[PDB]
Write a protein that binds this ligand. Structure first.
Ligand SMILES: *[C@@H]1O[C@H](CO)[C@@H](O)[C@H](O)[C@H]1NC(C)=O
Ligand SMILES: *[C@@H]1O[C@H](CO)[C@@H](O)[C@H](O)[C@H]1NC(C)=O
Lengths: 105, 105
């Protein structure tokens, strides 16, 4: 895959999660967008690296708020927050990412 | 919680997943909608029970197609298909459900 990434979820709704991605060089990236509950948010990589904060709540600059919370079929002890990112390439099919953070409740 | 539900995922993209829910009686339900890649799909419960098919592909009546596939940060051996459902109640906050099915790739 052309992208290295992970999500670092927080323990508290006031502390945003951090979405971190690095592009692997050529074929290059046309654009990258994150679908957030508050709208579609573009991402730019400086020299191929980006760290994005994703907020669990609305309280509060390019901001992206998680979709959620969601209930999950098996476990009644957690809820899901999520967004999705789409990065389009100059040549090829797009990469679609699922960014998931569970929070207690 | 006011709803009993689970998702039965399939092993093959030609076989849809089945979303199954039963309402627990009073306070009643105003409406229920599923956000699908092909649009917003309403759900009616007959006597409080519903089984809905969710298709992984477009090939093919009230149809709902999963959003996806999505890549996941840790595992490169699977992709995610998903949709979300919102059921509104006569009195109270809405119930939001996350319906997730992983498929190999
Ligand atoms: C599922 O429920 C268990 C407890 O029953 C919990 O420890 C676990 O974190 C839950 N799974 C997720 C993905 O949160
Ligand atoms: C995560 O990857 C492992 C193998 O590394 C796989 O067996 C497992 O099904 C994956 N998790 C999910 C949720 O698919």
């Amino acid at each position: 895959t052309g992208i290295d990434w992970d999500v670092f979820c927080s323990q508290n709704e006031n502390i945003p999660a951090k979405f971190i991605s690095r592009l692997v060089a050529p074929l290059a990236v046309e654009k990258m967008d994150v679908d957030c509950s508050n709208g579609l948010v573009p991402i730019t990589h400086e020299h191929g690296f980006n760290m994005m904060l994703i907020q669990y709540t609305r309280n509060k600059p390019g901001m992206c708020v998680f979709w959620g919370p969601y209930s999950v079929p098996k476990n009644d002890t957690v809820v899901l927050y999520t967004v999705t990112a789409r990065l389009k390439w100059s040549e090829g099919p797009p990469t679609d990412l699922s960014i998931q953070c569970y929070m207690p409740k």
